[PDB]
Structure formats: C-alpha cells, structure tokens
Symmetry: C3
Subunit: 271 residues, 3 copies
C-alpha cells in the first residue's frame, strides 16, 4: 500500500532521505508488539535493504583515497545488516521459542532438528535472516568472523530452498550463489556449489530482473576470468527498461547503477 510509493520510485535521493524515520517507526512498532511476526520481519528486511542500498553501495562508489570513510561505512552497514538479521530472527523466535539458542548452538544435530520444524510459512523469515548474516560476513574481516553464525545462516538459506525452491523468483538461490562463490572453502564455499545454485536461479528468475545477470558477471565471471561473459551479462542487465518492469522499479534502477559501475571498472577485475 505504502511500500508501492517506495518500490516504484525512480528518485534515489527521495527514498534515501525518507527511509530513516520509516525504519524508526517500524522499529518502534516492533518493540511495542514483539509477538507480531509480520512486524519483526518487516523491520528486519527494511534494515537489510537500507543497509545495502543506502550505506554499503554508496561507500563502494567512493574513491581510493577516501578508504577511511569507506571502511567506516562498511562497518556501519555490517552493524545494520546484523540488527536487521536479528530483528527478523525474532519472528522465528516468536514462532519457536528457544530457536535462537538451538540454531546457534554449534551442534549440527540441534541445528538440523530446529530447522526441520520450519514450514513454508517460515521461508520469508529464513531468507531475510540468512541474507542479513551473509551480507554482514561479506564485510567482516575473514579473521574475526564467526563460523558458527555463518554456517547457521547458510543452513537457514538452504532450508528455505528445500521448503520453497521458487520463492521470490529464486531470490534465495541468488544469495547462495554469491555466498558460495565468494566464501573460502573452509567456510563452506565452492564454485561447483555456486554454479548449481545459479542454475536453480535461472529456472525461476524474471527477464526483467537485472540482478541475476549481475550475479553471473560478478560472482562467477570475475573469479573465472571470463571477461567476455562478464560484458554480455552486464549488457543484458542494462538492456532492461525500468519503465517496463511490472514492479520494483527502484531496485532495478539500483541494480543498473551497479552494473554500470562494474562495466566502468572492468579493468580492475581482469587482465
């Protein structure tokens, strides 16, 4: 209802400047009604999307010399991802008391047993919690990360896949592709895994979606030194007309800014 005015927006600045109080209002509603699962999820998702689009992403477009401000913005995004993930996780905690202790126990059997309690109704929540933690990890120094948190997040994502492969046009497979391709094999990564996750994504994703093209270029083409594929994929991301998309015009605009940047910086990624 109210989200349409944000998701169909083409003016980034209007969104960036209005989203903060919105986050604050949802946050307050959530704390006033901690057993409302919808509110838990909503506010969690909001922090994670804000963290990406309006904290992390602008930091990425900063110049080499201002790395200090970059690092500080990355640390800021990291904290917001985690706040977002923890807010969404309270939807699972409300539905299954003790969920948080189990899921982060480091005990594989307890992790698996608690994830087996989840149903299709929990898929949205699994997706956002797992995504929040994976997005935080991507900005976490590989030395001071928390393998058990990371492992739990991915297992939540993998559980959502089992439950509901097609969810949000394959959005889960997208986050998994990125995780596997970028993650050290000590933390569960691997390119074979990344490719299979991407194969599932292509079954469900929209032709109007630039993100699966960008994921192909960024997560898969770069590590494999496939500059040809990188270029084609981004040309496909950029061929999409934001005015023609059925919804999420705002996210398409954001993704196309990112693909434009990747193209401009191609020389950084290949030899």
């Amino acid at each position: 209802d109210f989200t349409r005015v944000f998701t169909e927006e083409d003016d980034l600045d209007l969104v960036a400047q209005s989203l903060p109080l919105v986050l604050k209002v949802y946050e307050a509603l959530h704390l006033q009604n901690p057993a409302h699962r919808g509110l838990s999820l909503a506010v969690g998702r909001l922090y994670i999307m804000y963290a990406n689009a309006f904290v992390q992403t602008p930091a990425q477009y900063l110049p080499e010399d201002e790395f200090e401000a970059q690092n500080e913005a990355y640390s800021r995004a990291r904290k917001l991802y985690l706040r977002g993930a923890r807010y969404a996780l309270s939807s699972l905690e409300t539905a299954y008391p003790g969920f948080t202790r189990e899921v982060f126990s480091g005990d594989e059997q307890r992790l698996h047993k608690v994830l087996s309690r989840c149903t299709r109704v929990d898929v949205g929540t699994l997706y956002w919690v797992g995504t929040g933690y994976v997005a935080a990890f991507a900005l976490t120094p590989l030395g001071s990360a928390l393998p058990d948190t990371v492992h739990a997040a991915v297992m939540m994502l993998e559980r959502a896949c089992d439950l509901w492969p097609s969810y949000q046009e394959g959005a889960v497979w997208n986050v998994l592709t990125k995780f596997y391709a970028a993650a050290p094999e000590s933390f569960g990564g691997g390119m074979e895994k990344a490719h299979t996750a991407f194969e599932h994504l292509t079954r469900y994703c929209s032709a109007h979606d630039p993100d699966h093209h960008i994921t192909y270029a960024d997560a898969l083409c770069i590590p494999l030194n496939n500059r040809a594929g990188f270029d084609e994929a981004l040309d496909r991301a950029l061929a999409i007309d934001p005015e023609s998309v059925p919804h999420n015009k705002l996210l398409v605009i954001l993704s196309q800014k990112r693909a434009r940047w990747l193209k401009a910086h191609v020389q950084d990624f290949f030899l």
Copy 2:
C-alpha cells in the same frame, strides 16, 4: 494546520530534510484514494514546490565547474515538476473524465471546449498543472520540448486568469510573466504579453511579496538591459522583513536568497 509549521519556518535545512517523507505519505494517500481531488492537488503542489525550492534552486547556486552535477539536478527537478503536474492533473481528470486526452489532443477546438467546462473551483488545479509544465519546460532543451504540452499548459494558466484574475494575489500572472518573457515567440512568448501579465500582477500582489520584484528584475529587466530597474527592484525585494509578513515566511526567505544571488551576479546579466 500542519502546513503552518513548514510555511512559517525560517530554517531551510529542517524543511529540506523533513519534506521527503511528507511527499511520500501524501503520495501514498493519493494512490489509496485516487478520486480525492484535494489529495491529488496537494501532492502535486508539494512535488512542484519541493522541486523548485530544494532541487532546482540549490543547483543554481553551484559553481561553474560542477556543471555536470548541475545538469543532473536540473534533469531531476524537471522530472519532479512533471510528476507534480501529472498528480495535480488527476484532480481535473477526476472532475471531468477524458480531460487529459482532450487537453493534450493538439486540437485547438477540443482544448478550448474542455477548458470551457472549468469553473472557479478548478482554478487552483489549473494553476498548479500549468505551473508544473512551464517549470519543466524551462529546464527542457529547446530542441526536445513538446509544443502541444507547453501550449496546453499556458492555455490552462490563461483559463485560470479568465476565471479568477485575482487568484492567490495574482500568482497566475506571475508564472505567465515569466513564461512570456522567457519563451521563444514560436512557443507563444513575447515581451508585450509579458508586460501586460506583469501589469495584472501588480494589481493583486502584496507589498510583503518579494517575488513580484524579482520577476520584474529577472524576467523583464535582464532581457531589456535595464540594470537600473533590476537593482531597484531587488532592493525592494530585500527591504521586506520576513518577521513582519502575515504568512509564508519560508517562501519570503527563499525568494530573498534568490534576490541576493541575482545582485551578486549582476555582472553576468548586463554589460
């Protein structure tokens, strides 16, 4: 009620930072109640005022070398004017189904017939729609403009004049003065027209209003190389005490910033 806290404000930054979510809320209310004419108009007017005061105007105070950011801000204002004009136009469309097809038909007889259906009740709407389009045109490259849209906008403004000459202390005459003075005579402009429109404005405008002084200096004095009149007029705009005005202190503050800038840049405009 709530508008008083914005219109009597003297702190631009507080307004600039709070207006975006307000725009978003009105916008959402409008889409949730598309037959509410008041909401259509309100949100339209809001976008147009925001576009001017907080997008276009700050761009104008940028330095020569940052023309790129200037051009991008101008394109941004242009899109906001048009969104604003189109929102207000839905008030006319609600009142007279098919209004949009007629008014933009390019057929003078259909244009005139549909405008003849308008009454004094429609004057606010005519004014804002026409203003939005004229403000967009002012930022539109003379080569890629749309004569029929422009012509329809001015005819709406001229119809408001016929209906209600004195509306908002002659505000319509103000926009017309600016259009005629700045518009190529192929697009309906002309200085004789501009002067007559200004003569009507002086009949209705307030002594506490800086805008009619600025319009005289900017639209009329500059093209005619009347530096003497330019200076006097702006001195009159600046003699107004914002603390003494009965209302719209905020707009007076904005206009006086503009007159101060014009004075500082006088050498740009005369020889």
Copy 3:
C-alpha cells in the same frame, strides 16, 4: 515508547536524518494544543537536544578554514536553542499566566515572586528553559547579549535546584557548572560557584555518565590549566561501555565523541 528507538540508538546518522520531521510533527501538535504542558515541554526539549547534538556539535568538528560555515551553524544553533527555550517556556506560561512578563521584567522582586510560585512539578520545565537560554548565550557575542534574559534563565535553573536538587541525576548542577565557569563575573559567573555546583553534581550523577567527567575536564580543568586532571577525567569518560549503560546509549555515544575530540585537541587548551 517511541523515544526508546532514538535514545538507545548507536547510529548517529539514522537519528540525525529522522529527527527533523519528528520535530515538525511535535511542533504542529503543540500549536494545535497550546495548553498541553507536556507537548510544550516535549517539543522545547527536542529542539534544544537537536540543536546541540546535530547543529552545534558537528560545527565544532569543522576545520579552522571553514570558520564561515562554522559561524553560520553556530547562529543556526543559537536560534534553535531559543525556539526550544520559548516552546518550553509556554508550559510555564500555561500554568501561570503572565509568567513570561514577570520572569523577564528585570525586576528582581517580580522575578523572585513568580519563581516562588513554582513547584516540583515545574522542575522539568525550569531546567529546559534555563538550559535553552544558557546554551544560546554561550553562542551569543558577549557584547550583544541580554543580561536580563541570561539572569532570568540562571535564576530558573537555581530555582529548580532548590525545588529538586537530585533532578535527573543532578542534570541541573551540570548546566550551572558550565554556566558559572564560562560566564563573565559581570554576568554572574565565578569559579567558586562553578566548583560548588560540580560538588552537588557528583552526589547525584551516574558512574555510567560521561558528561560529568567531560564537564570537569572542559569547564574546570581548562581554565585552571590542570592538564593532568583533564586527561584523567576524559579517560574516565572514555572507559564507559555504551553497551553496558541502562539507558541513553545515544547520548553516551555523543559525549564520548566529544571527549575523544577534546583529547585530540589537548594542545589547544594547555601550554
């Protein structure tokens, strides 16, 4: 309820960007219900806290060469303090009609008589009004200040002390310490007064509070050239763990930024 999401925040930017519309909404509620004392106070306090944390403080962290922007931001904070003080003062005016004429009469007997009408219920209001005026004075050129306004403000603060010494963990004594230490003895200042006010503060303040440490360093150590004490005090301010505080995490974060700056600039203050 809603204030918790602001006061426990650790992200300054989210607060800074969301507070403006909040100020505007409270302001509108206040004008719509001018006899609501709670609303008068709330909006007053809000302007004063915003003025300090998000106008004055950032100006202070600007570089030497940008003194112009600094001076303009200081003038902006000054006006906001005064708007805030005047909003809170309307709570007293509602409770005791004619309060404003009396309290600013310049007649000591009228000032004292009206302050004698105040009770413990009025302490919050006295504190905020007095603080607003003292904070404005601190940014007012010593030559164009208003001794009677300043004197009335301090007398309001001193009356709150008499009524309720322990109020908000000694917050009144904190503002008085700063006033006395910084104020010319023609305007009522004096270091002996400042020290006694600080002694009262230590009786009531929290170990989790960085502000009393900063006040000791800044108001007392600097004028007395006690660099040793300055350093210890700020080390104490910085030893506090924001994650451990029972409340006002946001203010602790703000104060610790200030103590860090003081330490970095120690050479400015001692020889």
